[PDB]
Amino acid sequence: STPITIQGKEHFEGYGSVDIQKKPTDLGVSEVTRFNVGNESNGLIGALQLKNKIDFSKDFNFKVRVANNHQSNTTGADGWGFLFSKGNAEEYLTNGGILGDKGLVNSGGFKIDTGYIYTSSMDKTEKQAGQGYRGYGAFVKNDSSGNSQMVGENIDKSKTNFLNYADNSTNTSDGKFHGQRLNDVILTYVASTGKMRAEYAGKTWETSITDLGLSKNQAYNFLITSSQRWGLNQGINANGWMRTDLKGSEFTFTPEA
Ligand SMILES: [Ca+2]
Fold it and tell me: Ligand binding A region, squamous nasal epithelial cell binding: where is this region?
């Protein structure tokens, strides 16, 4: 048992609709990994699989740098799904994750929801419908049937999952959250409590891994996932780029022995 602390795209295998974007002038870094490129009739689907499994007997702390597309919540990406599973990126490409109503079984994780999916009953309850980069953050469980259900709670004073995933700011160094700019998603797990917490957009959420359907005596794949209009056979209309800087991200955990 030795924790490792790692940074960089070389610790990930990319699968599906992912590439490198060199010198994104709108984001202020050397490069990002970019989700939701090209055009397909059944939409776009991508994952990064961390090359090591995570031992859930031990704590982890991740800091993932993500920028959401500056796009309406019906032409852009479905969101971010930070997903823990025994399932792997190839099965994710075929089966889906945590950004709709169905995906990979007995899995769970944290979503930044950036796409209003008219077929999604979850998007209705969370009032995602409307103009104005309307989104929400939540932990999601996929049960033994692959059905996606929100779990855990928002634990900010505000006690809502709603967040604006982008804005029209021309003053992005003003100290405030600009969701179209790179921002920290902090995912922290403490083995001795079973608590997983997500921090993003100044907001905080918490669940137990038992409420995610995961177990402390197991090692899991970790997938950074995105999808754009995936499964709506409405094709792709627009740029839906969901971009992450893996070099400026940092992952501390105990890999599977
Ligand atoms: Ca949604």
Answer: 1-256
